[PDB]
Amino acid sequence: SSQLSQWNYNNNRVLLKRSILKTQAFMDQLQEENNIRPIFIEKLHVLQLKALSKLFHSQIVSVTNHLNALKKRVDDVSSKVFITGDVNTGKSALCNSLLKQRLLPEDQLPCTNVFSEILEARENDGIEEVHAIPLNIAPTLKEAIDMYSIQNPKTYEIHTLKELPDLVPQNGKYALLKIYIKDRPASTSLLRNGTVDISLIDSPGLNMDSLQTAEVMSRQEEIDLVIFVVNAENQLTLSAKEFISLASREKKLMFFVVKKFDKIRDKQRCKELILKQIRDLSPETYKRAADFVHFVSKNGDELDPYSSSDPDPDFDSLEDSLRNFVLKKRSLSKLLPAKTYLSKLLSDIIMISKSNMKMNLLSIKFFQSLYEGTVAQKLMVEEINLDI
């Protein structure tokens, strides 16, 4: 019944693009309303709030920018996996496990300073090479990543894969590293499987630089699936929770990979501490913990280690759930972030229109029209069924 999944995905994908449109329209009529007569302002899930009028304008501009990324993600047929977490938690060490090769530098000391995107060579004419995107080709980091084209040499420097160790630390020169690799049967490899185009992004560590952390939180809304690696010894830190909290505004579900669990003495107590924090941070991920919470110890430094077919039940299980989620449940893996965000945002608008109507007439009529309009929309969003 694999064809049924395709139809359901294309039907649900059609439904969400329509909802992002109508909600973007709502976002705009709020912006124009605010400008002529500032709006008057229980916790708002998305909107964080003369001072409120200018901050309001800043908020809508962010939501407008976020809906665009979601619009661009729903349209995109590929799935993007974002491996982030604290510094020195094993983000790069988890990627190597997934590719089954020591591609990305993994070191005791801080290493990854530049975003490392790993793609199949098919996109780069089947050529195994790194494409470094310079910071100086555009004003901001995103503007550079977004102007990158393989067909325009002025947007990237070509290096070899073994050049990676000397490239990833140059976060003052490069904006992103496009790594094109070639895989191994198709039923075993993750990048090339014949059904869904995946690209892994090895994130720089959280809790390192004020600017670097701003980069990660930004990049989060242009990816589809998050694998949050956790240091078993520290659990979920304030730097981690600040990210997850902001990421949970759209990602109801996401993976949690606890690494360095082999170093833990009180393994049970440590496991119960971690699980306690996922229930409070990602309540929906806790309900499906068996699928989304994994304890993987595989690494290349402690006793090519990734090629060995030695039995690794912990990792094998994670890699299975990832395949199942990204490949067999495209409705959940790709579109759930869109449905979740829309439902959160619409609730916010509904609250705003609520406090404004009844208690100039021009605003009373405007907000009643918007309350009845968004309540109706939020009802249609909830009718979208993605658990099929």
Is 367 marked as binding a ligand? no
Q: Which one of residues 107, 129, 163, 197 is an interface residue with K ion (CB under 5 A)? A: 107
Asked if 355 and 368 count as a contact pair (C-beta separation under 8 A), the reply is: no
For residue 41, with 0-12 CB atoms within 10 Å meaning exposed, 13-18 middle and 19 or more buried, which class applies? middle
Among ligand GTP, Mg ion, K ion, none, partner that 337 touches (CB below 5 to 8 angstroms by kind): none
For residue 238, with 0-12 CB atoms within 10 Å meaning exposed, 13-18 middle and 19 or more buried, which class applies? exposed
* Residues in CB range of 228: below 8 A, 6 or more apart: 84, 85, 240, 243, 244, 254, 255, 256, 257
Which one of 83-91, 272-280, 309-317, 349-357 is the stretch in contact with ligand GTP (CB under 6 A)? 83-91
Return d(Cα 117, Cα 36) in angstroms, integer.
44
Going by C-alpha positions, the residue among 75, 372, 341, 100 that lies closest to residue 221 is 341
- 92 near Mg ion (CB under 5 A): yes
Among Mg ion, K ion, ligand GTP, none, partner that 12 touches (CB below 5 to 8 angstroms by kind): none
Is 373 marked as binding a ligand? no
Cα–chain center distance at 274: 21
> Is residue 120 helix, strand or coil?
strand
Return d(Cα 253, Cα 291) in angstroms, integer.
10
Residue among 107 and 291 whose Cβ is closer to K ion:
107
Q: Which one of residues 15, 20, 81, 87 is an interface residue with ligand GTP (CB under 6 A)? A: 87
- 205 near ligand GTP (CB under 6 A): yes
Per rule CB under 5 A, count of chain residues that contact K ion: 3
- 111 near Mg ion (CB under 5 A): yes
Q: Which one of residues 80, 100, 178, 259 is an interface residue with ligand GTP (CB under 6 A)? A: 259
How does DSSP classify residue 263?
A: G
Q: Which one of residues 37, 122, 263, 279 is an interface residue with ligand GTP (CB under 6 A)? A: 263
Which one of 25-33, 54-62, 103-111, 275-283 is the stretch in contact with ligand GTP (CB under 6 A)? 103-111
- 111 near K ion (CB under 5 A): yes
Is 173 marked as binding a ligand? no
Among Mg ion, K ion, ligand GTP, none, partner that 126 touches (CB below 5 to 8 angstroms by kind): none
- 175 near ligand GTP (CB under 6 A): no
In the chain, which ranges are continuous DSSP H helix?
A: 2-36, 51-75, 91-99, 141-146, 164-167, 210-219, 238-247, 267-281, 283-287, 289-292, 313-323, 330, 336-356, 361-383
> Is residue 133 helix, strand or coil?
strand
Among K ion, Mg ion, ligand GTP, none, partner that 354 touches (CB below 5 to 8 angstroms by kind): none
- 300 near K ion (CB under 5 A): no
Bind-site residues for GTP: 88-93, 259-262, 297
Q: Which residues bind Mg ion (CB under 5 A)?
A: 92, 111-112
Q: Which residues bind ligand GTP (CB under 6 A)?
A: 87-93, 106-108, 110-112, 204-205, 259-260, 262-263, 297, 299-302
